[PDB]
Amino acid sequence: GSSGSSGVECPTCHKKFLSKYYLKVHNRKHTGEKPFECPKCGKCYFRKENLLEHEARNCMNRSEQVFTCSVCQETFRRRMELRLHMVSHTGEMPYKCSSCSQQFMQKKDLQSHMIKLHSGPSSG
């Protein structure tokens, strides 16, 4: 049935990809001991409660690579989206700017933003 094409393969789930890059980032999950994991698909869930929900909320199903929240188990076809969504759970992003008052998830992400956008090689 389902077929793929020239590319790498996951020595864990046996899932081929277009480029190693994706394969690696994908394996990120596999690695790292976990307490529980959906016995239907294989989604590790630190908290049991979360695991149970998911099973009902959503499970393995031929569909575009999406992301699942960690509080409401939402659905995001993109990674960044989830990041901009999590803020709703914690009010707002963990990091913020001062000149523009931007928002970021990482400290370095902000510092660099102020060192390039605010402190770029241009005078604009």
Report whether 61 contacts 68 (CB < 8 A): no
DSSP characters over 57-124: H----S----EE-SSS--EESSHHHHHHHHHHHSSS-SEE-SSS--EESSHHHHHHHHHHTSS-SS--
Buried b (16+ CB within 10 A) or exposed e, 40-56: eeebebeeeebbeebee
Residue 44 marked in a binding site: no
For residue 104, the cross-strand partners are 95
To the nearest whole angstrom, how small is the minimum distance from the Cβ of residue 1 to Zn ion?
A: 19
Q: Does 44 participate in binding Zn ion (rule CB under 5 A)?
A: no
Instruction: Return the residue of 4, 100, 107, 108 that touches Zn ion, per CB under 5 A.
Output: 100
Amino acid at 42: G
- Going by C-alpha positions, the residue among 67, 68, 65, 39 that lies closest to residue 52 is 39
Q: Does 97 bind Zn ion (CB under 5 A)?
A: yes
Shortest distance (Å) from residue 70 CB to Zn ion? 7
Interacting residue with Zn ion among 8, 22, 38, 76 (CB under 5 A): 38
Q: Does 66 bind Zn ion (CB under 5 A)?
A: no
- Exactly one of 40, 107, 108, 116 binds Zn ion (CB under 5 A); which one? 40
* Among the residue ranges 1-9, 44-52, 55-63, the one whose residues contact Zn ion (CB under 5 A): 55-63
Q: Using CB under 5 A, which of 12, 106, 112, 119 touches Zn ion?
A: 12
The residues of the shown chain that bind Zn ion, judged by CB under 5 A, are 10, 12-13, 15, 38, 40-41, 43, 59, 69, 71-72, 74, 97, 99-100, 102
